[PDB]
Design a protein around this ligand. Structure first.
Ligand SMILES: Cc1onc(-c2ccccc2)c1C(=O)O
Length: 167
């Protein structure tokens, strides 16, 4: 049994809710929250900007030190950093950004990072301002992630379309 409430069960291991990921993290304090990161860990907008704002920019400060030491992530890659006030840990995962012309086949590699964690609170990777089709992102998630994933989806309209169209 875990602390996640109000989720619709899609599969053995994937659950979904219409919820603002920031508010959900603040309430649950999960072991792992996933960030929709870019390779530079520049948390300007989208999920990343919202998570970082909720940490009062401490996520960005920590991320700048990580990049100064290690250099950029790979598209499809990840790193584990602090979860600050939102979670124990933040798994920063880089899905391909379609609006930058990145290979959508890298979305599966991105989701494979989730398998290193038993339970996660996450957004749909490569969706929103990353330009991918969120329906596709949910399909790759279900077909790739084997650990227990709680997907929070901000937009009620998109949430309803993801549930209604789920095979
Ligand atoms: C899809 C999608 O596109 N934009 C967002 C989003 C969610 C929270 C904060 C900012 C953007 C989002 C999501 O993960 O539900």
């Amino acid at each position: 049994v875990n602390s996640f409430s109000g989720y619709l069960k899609l599969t053995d291991n994937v659950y979904i809710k219409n919820a603002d990921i920031v508010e959900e993290a603040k309430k649950v304090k999960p072991t792992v929250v996933v960030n929709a990161a870019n390779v530079y860990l520049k948390h300007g907008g989208g999920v990343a900007g919202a998570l970082n704002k909720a940490t009062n920019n401490a996520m960005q400060v920590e991320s700048d030190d990580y990049i100064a030491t290690n250099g950029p992530l790979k598209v499809g890659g990840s790193c584990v950093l602090s979860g600050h006030n939102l979670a124990k840990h933040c798994l920063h995962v880089v899905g391909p950004n379609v609006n930058k012309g990145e290979d959508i086949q890298l979305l599966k590699s991105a989701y494979e990072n989730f398998n290193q964690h038993e339970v996660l609170l996450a957004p749909l990777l490569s969706a929103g301002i990353f330009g991918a089709d969120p329906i596709h992102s949910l399909r790759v998630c279900v077909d790739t992630v084997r650990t227990n994933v709680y997907l929070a989806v901000f937009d009620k309209n998109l949430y309803d379309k993801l549930v209604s169209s789920f095979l």
